[PDB]
Amino acid sequence: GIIPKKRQELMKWNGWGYNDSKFFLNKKGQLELTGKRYPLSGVALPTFKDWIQNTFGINLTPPSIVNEDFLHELKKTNISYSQEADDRVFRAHGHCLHEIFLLREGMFERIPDIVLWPTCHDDVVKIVNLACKYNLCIIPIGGGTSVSYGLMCPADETRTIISLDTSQMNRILWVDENNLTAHVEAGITGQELERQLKESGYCTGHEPDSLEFSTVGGWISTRASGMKKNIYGNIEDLVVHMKVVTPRGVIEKSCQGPRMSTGPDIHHFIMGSEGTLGVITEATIKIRPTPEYQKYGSVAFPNFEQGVACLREIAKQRCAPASIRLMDNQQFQFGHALKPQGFDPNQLSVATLLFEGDREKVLQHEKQVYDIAAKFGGLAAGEDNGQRGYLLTYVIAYMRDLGLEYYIIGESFETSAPWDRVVDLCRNVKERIRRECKEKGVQFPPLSTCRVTQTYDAGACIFFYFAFNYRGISDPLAVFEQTEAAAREEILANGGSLSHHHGVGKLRKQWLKESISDVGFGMLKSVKDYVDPTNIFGNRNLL
Template sequence: MSDIATVVDLLTDALGADAVDVDPASLASASHDTWPVSTKWARQDEHPYPADVVARARTEQDVVAVLRVADETGIPVTPRALGSSVTGQPLPTRGGIVLDVSGLVGPHSIDEIDMTVTAPAGTNGGELEDALNAAGWTMRFSPQSLYRSSVGGWLATLATGQFSSRYGGVEDLVVGYRVVLADGEIAELTASPRAAMGPDLRRLFLGSEGTLGVITQVTYKILPLPADQRLQAFRVPDVPAGLAIMREQAAAGLRPFLLRFYDTDEARHAMADPGFDGPVLFVGTEGEPAVAAAEMGVLTEIAARHGATTLGPEPAAAWMGRRFDFSTVEKRLDTPGGFAETIEVAHTWRHIHGLYTDVKAALAPLADEVLVHFSHVYPQGTSMYLILLGQVADDAAATARLEEIWATAMRVCLDHGAELSHHHGGGLARSPYSRRSLGSAHRVLRRLKHALDPDALLNPGKLGL
């Protein structure tokens, strides 16, 4: 590996001095994301994974140049966009270059005939969605981080959105993309609209977290804005009843755009009512008015069969208005000794209630509140999202508690055979558990890594690699 001064000189020659940064404040900023553990490190002025240099790409050719410098010098490269990861994905575990791709921005292109939008990978997702809405279109992709995340980052982390029960995850949204490989070669992966010429190579880099290549441009599906929307909230007798409603509607082939079921502890937050005394289900349908009305009617019948009663549309509408608000977690983390964490997992219908019971019991002694909701539904099962809030003596104790929470949650999930991540990806938080979670499939991942990045320079330390 070359010394960092040589690398800085090569990067400066390739990108220009204004795109290469070794300022200590910049390096510190590039060495953290919004993972609560990393947030607590930053509050204590601790930087366990410091970058050596930040290289800011403004074009695809800049990305090519950086990866060729890395290939030539043997220095690791950690891609980073808007830094909204909550699991430590863009933290440079071996130092080296942090490749900032948030500057890959510029005009987007809407194809109204084929119903697609193409944009540079660093484009802010919320800004793109706003521009599409102004033109009468939508991606209908709505992660809580919509206005904090990039459209390329969605692919790299295999993200999904709050409306996935109707529109699916990013794997259902993507049409094609461009990626720069470890040696600087550019590959374009697409299908028009579907292809059966060998494996679906578009899937190869989805969820790879920058370990196999750097995404530079994306093309996503778009739809006309929905003509109608219906909302409803239901009081539900208990958690098994709520899960039964979700399973039955999935089996019936319904496609509500909104389907969020909260246990009693989180229902108090969802309803903004500390005295609310039971689980609650928020439902939304949309599309052509007759279809949206019919789907809501069937959903209401299914809910009633399981003992649910209607509360009106207002609670669900209120949630729609604040669905991007992350302030509860942020405020707690910004308090000395305060801690907050979000962990999302998934399991089948057969096993999800047992997982819920055991993981909540295991985590209860570690936090003041353990809140749970189920919000992404499939014919075979559902995701489960945990929010933990608590207070300890100081930030050092909070860091230790967060690490204990992760170890406990992952142990219980592995014991249950659950998916360790539904949509936040692996990052540093889950990397130690990746091999056990993936089992024999991890051997395939390792072989892909060796083939595409034989010197292991791209985002080392993630996905158990």
């Protein structure tokens, strides 16, 4: 649960997650996740092979450049550090498909020169002051799970780049049971956070799909969103307090009030700042008693549009359960192919549901939901089919490394949009992808899929998967990366946002000024130029 210093002992240098977990074919020729870590671990998936085959038409380093008298002064603090190639390479990237290619195939252009491992707030203060004194460049890293190029080192950064690794700065500092808050160190992962809260009878309920590795500091930095936000809030509702070390000095409010009116909220200057302003070291987060009961469910709809209209109605009545998701037909069948052991089934769409709270309330709420669904032609599809798409939630990123071994490339991307744009966006965006792949010479129709993943009063988060069999293609990355950018253009033309939770990093920089206005961009820059005049925090995300 604590990320160890040498990450490659536990985690894959060249892909997602733990060394001991990959898809392989078992002794019966069926796909299976190796290892003992998950629910799905060791569970044969008899129809997954057949699904992959039908869907995709397949069968089956630079030296360290670091100052000698900086290094000297660092030796004084006994802060742990490393200049080893694997250590720097492990931290030179996140989890974009571009990045995960290179790794396996070539080498990166720039990697950190030196990794540092602070264990507390004061360590981070010292590091930041050394960086000021000796003109060095810092890139913070927590889980390393960025999907937005947020950790890529600018290839023209000629300063020494410090990788400031927050993974040893990872304690629950205090739990305040009267105020239901917990003060934690920013390097704690979501797993280690919940596991510890759970022993006192509390949780945070913040469940991004990367919680095994993503950290509190990361969440704040990227404006992270979790599967159960309908109950617990997204990151900007969970955080009541934070402490940030910048070159200019330390940021922190003096009181733990729940809500204030003392000028523009400075917390909001830091959430989303994507590593560009300083290091978030500590944060206070709301907690909640561990829910009494959990119930899964699912609903089948005659088509995707009926499903969307139902999710709209559920949001309009303000009775979304802990989680509700609507998959289109493709993503359904994906799902249904992964089972252990009326309607037209080619347009048929499926919502999955998660209820949690008092057992009394769950089954009451559940009934209100299926009654609403029934007005749209919804029909209960059973708890097991619901319980699946959610026990399957944390495997999906192991699947990418399995596609790559068979010449399949895919990646996800997401947006949020007002309710009245959701249907046209899904359609036009899934169709632009298909159009671009054919025009770029992809030989097989891509996987082009969407789901509705979060509901809000004023609209929805939409999630896309895109993948294709690249064989016979000259330059597969370029095609892919051109098709993704075209999908983004389709997204923005259909009134969707630049991003709902992934952030901007360096992947989506080119669209920011248009998204937030020129003066908006100027405002961000003006904070940057004040907090960090000498651009110590030089990952160049956002701006």
